[PDB]
Amino acid sequence: RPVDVSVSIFINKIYGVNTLEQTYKVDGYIVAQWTGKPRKTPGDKPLIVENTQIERWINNGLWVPALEFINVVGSPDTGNKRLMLFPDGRVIYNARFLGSFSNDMDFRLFPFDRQQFVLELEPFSYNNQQLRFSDIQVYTENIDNEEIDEWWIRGKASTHISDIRYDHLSSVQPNQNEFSRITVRIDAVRNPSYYLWSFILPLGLIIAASWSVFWLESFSERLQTSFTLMLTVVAYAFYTSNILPRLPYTTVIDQMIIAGYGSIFAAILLIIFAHHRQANGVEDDLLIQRCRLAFPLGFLAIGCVLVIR
Amino acid sequence: RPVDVSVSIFINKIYGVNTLEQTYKVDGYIVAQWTGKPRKTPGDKPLIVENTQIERWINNGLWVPALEFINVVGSPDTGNKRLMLFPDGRVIYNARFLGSFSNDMDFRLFPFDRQQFVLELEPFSYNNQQLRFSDIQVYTENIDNEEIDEWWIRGKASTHISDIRYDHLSSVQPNQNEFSRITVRIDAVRNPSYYLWSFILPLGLIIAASWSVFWLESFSERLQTSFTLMLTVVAYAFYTSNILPRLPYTTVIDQMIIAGYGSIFAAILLIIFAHHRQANGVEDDLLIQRCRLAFPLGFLAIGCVLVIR
Amino acid sequence: RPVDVSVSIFINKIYGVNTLEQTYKVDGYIVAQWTGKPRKTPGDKPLIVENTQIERWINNGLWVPALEFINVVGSPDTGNKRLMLFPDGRVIYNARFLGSFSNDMDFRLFPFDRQQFVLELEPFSYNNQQLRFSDIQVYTENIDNEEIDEWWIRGKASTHISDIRYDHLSSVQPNQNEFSRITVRIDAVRNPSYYLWSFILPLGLIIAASWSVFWLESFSERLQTSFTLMLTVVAYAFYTSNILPRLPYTTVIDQMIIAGYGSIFAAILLIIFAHHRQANGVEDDLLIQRCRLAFPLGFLAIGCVLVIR
Amino acid sequence: RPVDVSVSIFINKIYGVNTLEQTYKVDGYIVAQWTGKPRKTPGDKPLIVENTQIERWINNGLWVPALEFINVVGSPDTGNKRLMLFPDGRVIYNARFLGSFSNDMDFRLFPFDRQQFVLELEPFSYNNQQLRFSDIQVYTENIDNEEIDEWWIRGKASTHISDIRYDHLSSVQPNQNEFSRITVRIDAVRNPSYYLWSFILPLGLIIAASWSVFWLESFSERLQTSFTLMLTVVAYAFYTSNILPRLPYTTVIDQMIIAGYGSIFAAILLIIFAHHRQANGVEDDLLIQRCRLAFPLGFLAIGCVLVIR
Amino acid sequence: RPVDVSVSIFINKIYGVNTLEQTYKVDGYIVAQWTGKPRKTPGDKPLIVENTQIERWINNGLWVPALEFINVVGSPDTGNKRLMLFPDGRVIYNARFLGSFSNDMDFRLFPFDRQQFVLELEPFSYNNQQLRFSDIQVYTENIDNEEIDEWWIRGKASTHISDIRYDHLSSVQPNQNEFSRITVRIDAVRNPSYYLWSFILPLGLIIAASWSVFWLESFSERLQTSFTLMLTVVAYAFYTSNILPRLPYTTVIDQMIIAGYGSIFAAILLIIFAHHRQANGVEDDLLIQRCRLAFPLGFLAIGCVLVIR
Ligand SMILES: FC(F)O[C@H](Cl)C(F)(F)F
Ligand SMILES: FC(F)O[C@H](Cl)C(F)(F)F
């Protein structure tokens, strides 16, 4: 009894990740085929109906089922519409769309995270007793120049037809509450180049050269240099957070920065201590200089336990 | 006599809080059911009317009352509309919406604020003598990975149908001035993660380490260094202001920063004081040295009386 | 002859002031009542016609005159429309609007300026021989938590019906160049809180401690520290300009910064001077030290004639 | 043979110059008058048609020619449309518009540039054999409290009606390839106030005090300080470009900053030279000190011959 | 059998490249000519149908094939539409458009990159058995004062009609899967001035002057300065990244900055090494001074082999 509808989704561009909103843009076309009461067409050739005309055929009683992108955020930008009406009953709906879609996204592993871009498609009014998805095909471009792309799309789309029970329906009871839903998935990993070389590396180099505070010979030189190193971290904190995507949690890079702030406060506690440890007023040289290769290990080992995954 | 309307609101996403404008975005569906004069439907089965076709039934006189979101800011983006016409009189309105909504929002406890996301729903044209809200259902998705969300939704939505006296009317007098209104409330708190770890903590380390100025032994070392400390607070003031939400009042971090400005201006006053307090130019190294844990308590006390609540 | 129309304007939110464009947003409702040729209504009860149906009645020849917001910038976002048609002739137009409005805005005393939010309403086609405004009512909410509002609405709203002569007309001549215009005024003052505590004050502490450059005892110390003070000002300029509203002129704050810029250059010239004022190559430490209160007073005096308002 | 069209343009606001896009915003009204087939109006008084109704009259065969703003960027926001239909034949089209317009804009003398704001209006479909522009009237308010205005309008609008021959037309040949085009010009200059006091002047004070490095005593003092002077220029470059208009070229202010970078690199090149020029290792203070007026004049001499215009 | 369509594309402005999205905007006209069943026109002169009227003529069965821009991103803003209906059958569609287009864009050689802006035009429904592009003419303005333009368009546009096989179709079989496609390409190179003079050059000047650490005479001086130089580079990274285009990879300038980061970390390592390389702990001033001409040549040699393309 229920009508079988065949869907094909051609994906043109996935662009513009919104990190705070957990959304993304997808441009492509959607195709839908189903079969109805056969029809008299001008010539025994299939009939083509574009854009403003489809509305007219609907007023004469053509059944064109509303298919909703569930995880889209607000009505998508619809390009051209097409009905290809075959004389032998079958009907093809073809539409181009650009829409900003929503999905759960964990950005904690930035810049080395993998994400999956999803489309969720479901009919708006007719349940699986009325309209069901027979099959789903998703086609993607084959990207070869992905090294100039922000994201490396990682493997072909996965498809998934299932049924959804909306328990709370104000309608009827026997199975009038289940709807048939297509789900498209595309896996991807982030192109970590720019973030590796232009952010991670110099943060290391800076945190590195911070240790070279201990090879200054007076105390006065060492503590005062600590305040210029101090400022540099704040500056580097400002630099990253202004360019990196805003998020509600700490990333890898964010943590290196918290680590950089610690190492600098750490030295200030010691440099000030070594000036006062033992009697004689001795700048505990017994302590410093031994720190010239103590801290680069202390930071680098107690820093080797950031396995938050 | 009055028409009874039953409302169901499905909430999909509450995102994009706007601090300055006091708004937030809500994507969902809204459902309204009422019963009218029973009807001839094709088959004794309910009738489904999608989108552009609803306008047609209106011109032939189907009564579909406009229900307005009172606390929206501008006409919402409405996705698919749907009428389900049952033969036994009952009528179901189903429409998807995305809208920017307004409510009172206090951000003084940032990053530890609790908010109320609110919806207020009321008919646009018909009073409670004519149309009244019978009951209200609000459904919320269940967030399990809340550690990657901007906001933690805290408990299920509370609702309240109420009545409103509109004083200034051009209509008539006998009981023609009250309207039926749904009010949905959702409580939520901010995910304080990114801000404790990447803002509060280094502000402490910076504000703490400002104090290590008193462990320099020269006067020249002490006064000149605090000016490097001065630059560091403005840079940190600059960092915060660029990333934290724009507001028309001071937050806690805002106050700590001013305290940071004070702690350093205060210090410059003592350093200059202890050098000329006593006769002969003897540097009062009793005031200094006493300051080495005088300030870590004074600030830590005058900031421990930021109990403004 | 001319139709008297009674207007009521309900204001919900005045938000989103744009300083550079001198615009602001207003959300509210508008009511217009006038009386025409009496009508057949279903029941002796008034007829309610919403949204898409109003357009229909215009085509059957119903007169609904277009009332234009003079100072709106672009087509306002119209929410729900409603006609209330009375059997006794009279007609009530009700529509919700959100719109961006323009008015002259002087921001020179920022953050201590007062602005007035203005609405200017005038019919689009019909002069006052045809359509004139009988009376105008403006209703505004009671801001109770005004300490959490950015703008303090200061006294209830002002109203004023008037007539406007359009000299340059391509029409006729006979007093057909005058139009009936409602002009709503709302005065408001800026909540100067955030800017005092987080901008004016720390700028003071910074400008003040600039003066403590004269209590360094060396010439090298005094001269070299001022270059750091210099850096501290440029830094503070960047903090302010990036956060404060952008304008085509200098504000109060904009000037303080220029003063700090001056004072440091003033200090640099003295600090470099007292090193060469007297013969012997002796530092006129009479001059400096006089400066420990020449600048804190001199700057504070020739800068205390900042009665520029 | 051709229909004469008389145009009136009332300009309400010119705002929002986009420096990078070379565009500017214009709010106003446009009025076009022509004379046609005399007509029956209800009563012997002219007829008014508003908004949605103009379309209806177009369908019963009223000619209202589409007039295109040639240098607009994308379809403009048309507020109200109004048709005034005269019994003696004349037809007056009155429409309010807000649109983003384009013109070549050279911003190289910023902040001392003059721009001319242009409107170009031409019929979309009809040539000068068919439709021609009779006259163009442009009405502008006179902005007198121009001191809070970003731009000083250098007098009332100039116009130029001409004919434009389009080579590549797919139409017919004998004189059917020329179109009637109005060109409105408004001249204006930028108010250099804000940019003089808040950008030009403190850059001068800083570039000036940069020179006060030659008045430090040891070579260590002299060289170590210019690296802080260096940091200061970079801090100031950042301040400007983040607030000043975005462009594809160097401005005046841009160059001042390049000059400051030069002066400081120049001083370092000299400071290091005067230290090793002679044998004995003796400090060549003949070269230094002479530089105390070499740079303050050299920059001020080689910098007042920037007659690049 | 198939209809020949002759296309003309007039390009008005190419503006607003989005580096991240790999998009750019194009304003222009499109003209399409084909010949159909001849027609009786009012007078024996061609008929002009504008905008809303074209819509009407379609509903009575005028064939106007919808032509889609393949690589536009979202529904472009259609300006005026015009049908010119000739009596001898031919039909000309002319419409103005503004749209955002996508193409692969490689920005690695910034600011010296070349881009080609492409337009790809193809019918939405009709194959080359039904509709084909006969010829394509492309018209571009001649940029004469191109020195104020961000992009230099380099030569006339190249065009190419070709045919496209779509494999995955549910439609017909005998040659029914191929579509006709116009492809326009426009070459352009970037105006490298502003980025050369305001970014590359002062970056050189700073990276150079960084080297002058080796001419300070104390170890204390040389090392403490490296930390101030360190700060200057972080500042300069922030300035560039905030002003320059966002990309997913490192550019030439991004590389210069990493080099400055390296050179400074390089020196810190040597300065600290030269202090302990030799026995006695005496500063190996042999290594130093040799470094005064090691780095400007070493950096200039191993950095002139960044021919990475
Ligand atoms: F306040 C400062 F941080 O400003 C900039 Cl980044 C510095 F350090 F270069 F001066
Ligand atoms: F960074 C260096 F310039 O050192 C500190 Cl921040 C200054 F500016 F005070 F000199």
Author numbering:
A (entry chain B), B (entry chain A), C (entry chain E), D (entry chain D), E (entry chain C): 10 to 318
From the paper:
In this study, we co-crystalized ELIC with the general anesthetic isoflurane, which is known to inhibit mammalian neuronal and muscle nAChRs3132 and GLIC33. The crystal structures of ELIC-isoflurane were determined with resolutions of 3.0 Å and 3.4 Å in the absence and presence of agonists, corresponding to the presumed resting and desensitized states of ELIC, respectively. As a homolog to eukaryotic pLGICs, ELIC shares similar pharmacological profiles of eukaryotic cation-conducting pLGICs with respect to modulation by general anesthetics. Thus, isoflurane inhibition via a direct pore-binding mechanism is likely accomplished jointly by stabilizing the closed channel conformation and blocking the open channel.
For ELIC crystallized in the presence of both isoflurane and the agonist BrPPA (presumed in a desensitized state), the FO-FC omit electron density map also indicates double isoflurane occupancies in the pore. The bromine atom of the agonist BrPPA co-crystalized with ELIC produced bromine-specific anomalous signals in the X-ray diffraction data collected with a wavelength near the K-edge peak of Br (0.9199 Å). The anomalous signals and FO-FC electron densities revealed BrPPA binding sites behind loop C and nearby loop A in the extracellular domain. These sites were reported previously to bind agonists, competitive antagonists, and modulators in ELIC404142 and in other pLGICs4344. The observation of isoflurane in the pore of ELIC under desensitization conditions could be attributed to an open pore-blocking mechanism. By this mechanism, isoflurane occupies and occludes an open pore and then remains in the pore when the channel desensitizes. In contrast, isoflurane molecules in the modeled desensitized pore moved away substantially from their initial positions and deviated from the center of the pore. In contrast, mobile isoflurane molecules inside the desensitized pore increased the RMSF of the pore region.
